[PDB]
Design a protein around this ligand. Sequence first.
Ligand SMILES: [Mg+2]
Ligand SMILES: [Mg+2]
Ligand SMILES: [Mg+2]
Ligand SMILES: [Mg+2]
Ligand SMILES: [Mg+2]
Ligand SMILES: [Mg+2]
Ligand SMILES: [Mg+2]
Ligand SMILES: [Mg+2]
Ligand SMILES: [Mg+2]
Ligand SMILES: [Mg+2]
Ligand SMILES: [Mg+2]
Ligand SMILES: [Mg+2]
Ligand SMILES: [Mg+2]
Ligand SMILES: [Mg+2]
Ligand SMILES: [Mg+2]
Ligand SMILES: [Mg+2]
Ligand SMILES: [Mg+2]
Lengths: 95, 236, 76, 45, 117, 243, 50
Amino acid sequence: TVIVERWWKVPLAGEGRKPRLHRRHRVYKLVEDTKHRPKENLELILTQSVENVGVRGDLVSVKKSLGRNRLLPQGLAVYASPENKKLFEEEKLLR
Amino acid sequence: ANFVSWKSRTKYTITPVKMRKSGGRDHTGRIRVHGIGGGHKQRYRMIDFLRFRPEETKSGPFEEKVIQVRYDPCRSADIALVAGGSRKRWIIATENMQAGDTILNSNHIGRMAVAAREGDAHPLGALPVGTLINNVESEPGRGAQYIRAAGTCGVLLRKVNGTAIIQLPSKRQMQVLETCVATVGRVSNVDHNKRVIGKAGRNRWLGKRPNSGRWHRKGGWAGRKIRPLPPMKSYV
Amino acid sequence: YEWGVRSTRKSEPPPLDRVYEIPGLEPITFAGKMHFVPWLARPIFPPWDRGYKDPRFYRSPPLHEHPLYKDQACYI
Amino acid sequence: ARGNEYQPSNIKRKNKHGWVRRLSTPAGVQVILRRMLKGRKSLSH
Amino acid sequence: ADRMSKWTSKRGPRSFRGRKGRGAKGIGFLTSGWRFVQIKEMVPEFVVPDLTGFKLKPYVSYLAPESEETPLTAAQLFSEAVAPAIEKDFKDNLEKYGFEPTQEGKLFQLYPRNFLR
Amino acid sequence: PLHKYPVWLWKRLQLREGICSRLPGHYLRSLEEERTPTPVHYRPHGAKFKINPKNGQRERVEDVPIPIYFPPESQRGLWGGEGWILGQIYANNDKLSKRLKKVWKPQLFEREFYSEILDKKFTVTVTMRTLDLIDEAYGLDFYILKTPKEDLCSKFGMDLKRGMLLRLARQDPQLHPEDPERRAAIYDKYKEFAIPEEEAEWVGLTLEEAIEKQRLLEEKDPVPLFKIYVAELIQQLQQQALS
Amino acid sequence: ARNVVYPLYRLGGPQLRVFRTNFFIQLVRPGVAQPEDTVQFRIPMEMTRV
RNA sequence: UUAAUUUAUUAAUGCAAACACCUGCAUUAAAAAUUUCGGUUGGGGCG
RNA sequence: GCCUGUUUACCAAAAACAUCACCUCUAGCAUCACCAGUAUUAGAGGCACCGCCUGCCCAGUGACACAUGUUUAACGGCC
RNA sequence: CCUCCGCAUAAGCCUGCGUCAGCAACUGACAAUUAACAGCCCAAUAUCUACAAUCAACCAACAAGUCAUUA
RNA sequence: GCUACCUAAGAACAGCUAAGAGCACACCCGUCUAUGUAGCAAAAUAGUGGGAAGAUUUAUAGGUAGAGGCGACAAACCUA
RNA sequence: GCUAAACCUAGCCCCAAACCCCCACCUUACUACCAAACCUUAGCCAAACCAUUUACAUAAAGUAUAGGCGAUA
Ligand SMILES: [Mg+2]
Ligand SMILES: [Mg+2]
Ligand SMILES: [Mg+2]
Ligand SMILES: [Mg+2]
Ligand SMILES: [Mg+2]
Ligand SMILES: [Mg+2]
Ligand SMILES: [Mg+2]
Ligand SMILES: [Mg+2]
Ligand SMILES: [Mg+2]
Ligand SMILES: [Mg+2]
Ligand SMILES: [Mg+2]
Ligand SMILES: [Mg+2]
Ligand SMILES: [Mg+2]
Ligand SMILES: [Mg+2]
Ligand SMILES: [Mg+2]
Ligand SMILES: [Mg+2]
Ligand SMILES: [Mg+2]
């Protein structure tokens, strides 16, 4: 996503008033574009005998393209929520 | 604007169709092409450029009979009313095509070549390499979208595995699949090039308005651009 | 080469509102009103048949309900 | 020859300036609204 | 060039003078050859009673007494029309008394008017 | 002269006069609330006060939002809290050059999702930030049932919120028929967002669509006065019979 | 009758009947010479020939 | 226009992003857009 | 100036513009122009029928191709 | 003594030299233009409609053309 | 609704010699002179003229709209 | 002494208070009747040009700030 920043600073409005904007507060300055950040892996739990990304019951770190585009549609992996990690630690105690 | 296109007839028909001139105008009513408008009134003969199509509940190669070779106002090459089985259709005529002529529309690529007559159609694998061809498809079943004007002809330079290479009359080579249909011979109405318009009125009868009088200065585009030949383009 | 351009064929109806994809809810359209409203959903109307018979608005059956339809074609 | 200009016909008057044309576009709808807010007797041809 | 004048049927060209008419009503339809079919049932039949022996003249004599206006409300017409039938059939299915819930099968419907006037 | 009430109150007055006065109060509360969305296109400040470098004195700061334009294609799908930014730039990021206007459009992706509550794969034009919010919410059903109406900012997303909330409210056995255990797994998973069936039907309606819904509720073919007057008369004669 | 919405006729419907006639009539004297078997009226606009 | 400032705009590439199109950021053009055309001077131009 | 034509409604109808003819450039292609066309075609320009002819030049610009080069019926120059 | 005008239709206009009254067609009241001419048309769904016009015949073309059904 | 170009479906072009031919009406235009200059006319009148089967003229409806259209470039015409 | 002069009240303005208003008619409006909406305002002007810029209860306070650090905000 695109994060912009105002060039001209807004005079502050108060506690119960909104800031009224001039045509010079419409002049923005691109401070960051989020798509050009170094991307992050997401944590998952695979539930089958998948490729080298992991085995049954393990929470791992996958690229978002393989994780969103193959694993989560096909039922192979579940999200790394705190709610299912209880069920899979309790699965690991049944071994 | 209220531009509804006249090109709306869904079913193929032998008859002439009343067609509406554009004047060079868009669907938005503004001129996009200059110098169009005001010619003699014309009616459109629907041409079946997909040369090998079978009729209903028939297949294979089939003969056809030329009933009348006819002037066409909508293009430079004259056309032939050609009847076969239970359907008449307008096709575009080759050079020496008379009334009563008979044409083989074929689909079978022979193991040998096919020493074809002047006006029949064959797939490109069924020809001797180096014959004058016209009405060349780009894909199998696409329809003849190439080499269709009067007197033009293309030549089959070489054919390779599943491949023919046509030479267009611009002398650019084309790589087409082996199994698309083309017709042999050159297109009719030859010596359309050696034609004297004679006066500006005969140029206005064709729907061609005069050029503007605004004097343009010639820029770098207007030399004698000797270019090298363009690379051979394929549709495979 | 199909005859008939896109601009002169029957115009495609606009795509259905995404309200209809959700199973649980009944959509709210301008069928409760009796006129178009652009800020409500467009309803799906049942295929309406004129109950009685009228001669100047007769619509013939398609060419199989005609009681003499021979598959073997005659040439007349 | 100049000044003859207005060369009348009722078809071009209704199809150029009439009510149905003024309601065909929202600009002409705002025209009719300026006529009713001004208070005129004839809002259109 | 007029704006103030009412756009009457006398005014346009032939195609405009043909379509627009006065406040008359359609009686039939046009068919091929522009042949007008007049539908018999669309014509209003003036149902006119017999005016023989009828003793109401268009004016009333001045010796008639003056009374008060009591417009027929729904409670009055229910009262004198229905209420003794209810009282006589109560001292011993609302359709028994002249009530019809639906009126699609009715000839002269009250809402909407399918009679005239 | 003047008006009695100011002009920006007038729409709020329209929520008092007629058909809007008969709207249920939990809907009108949900329109009267003015809360801000999550900052999408601007870094929010840390605290309210901020000690500036130029004179070293703490001065209060706010976080003025960026005006975001939402085209109706954003209401066809689920974008994030984001749309086109209509704004202006200075030409070489110094102000003494030409000012010239720019639209920052977001990057769109026609993806596919599976709602386990509504039990359906949707094809949604979506943004990368939306997918990141789905991952941060651990599922699209949690993401739609967690996001506030203002923040989620889609017509189709509030439609999905209304459909999921009616599916959870009624405990509908049309979720997975001939399998009640799986329905109890889903219905226990999203148990936290249980809402009454009265309040769930009004979730995510616009004001005009709610006027249409309220109008279709209380419309009736009117009572003929014969039934009313027969009720009055048999009740009146039952009052006579007790005399 | 005039200034009354007429009920719409479909094929096979009942006869359209007017009971209390709304429009009046007046026969005027002809200002020009006319045949002896001709009476001239002033119909109000919404009244046809039939 | 080879004046100054631009490139919002199109069209090309390039790199990210996404697994060709779209979007972001750069570069190159074409089309343009905004703006201006100092002074003295035995009138002004030239010097 | 080849011709017939066109133009400054309301001060210029011309030698100006157009034009047959000739030449240069761009374009290998379908379903809203071009066009329901396909290089003998279409579009962008120049000059002005036909007849005898159109000489020399890529230094500079611009285009072309990145084989440092090609281009003048391209801008232009020809002691 | 003029007439290169006239009479109609189209388009336009909307009662604007009809009756009565009040340089030397204006106001009030009344009255009229009457359909055969001309507008205002068409039940679907498939399926047909290659051969100009010009006295249409010889001819002669090119700029390739204004006219139709069947189940 | 003028005018520039176009779209649709229409129309007119006598006579004479023999084809964007010639003479020549109707019709279109406006060379040249004169009148007129608050005029009959915010561009006319009288005569002379160029064209008049064609790139003609014209009635009707439709289209293109001002950062534009349109242009056989006059930087014209787009309601004096 | 002709033209004429005069005239006083229709109404209006600024406040306050109070939150207002049968029939035909989107086809050629005034016609009885048949298979789709949202998208920064800009510019004049001031800066003695112009090109970034240029306003749209009280009190703090024209203060902190911003600004071809200048007009000004
Ligand atoms: Mg040319
Ligand atoms: Mg020229
Ligand atoms: Mg005219
Ligand atoms: Mg001096
Ligand atoms: Mg000449
Ligand atoms: Mg002229
Ligand atoms: Mg002039
Ligand atoms: Mg002149
Ligand atoms: Mg010339
Ligand atoms: Mg001639
Ligand atoms: Mg002269
Ligand atoms: Mg002549
Ligand atoms: Mg012209
Ligand atoms: Mg010039
Ligand atoms: Mg000039
Ligand atoms: Mg200034
Ligand atoms: Mg200045």
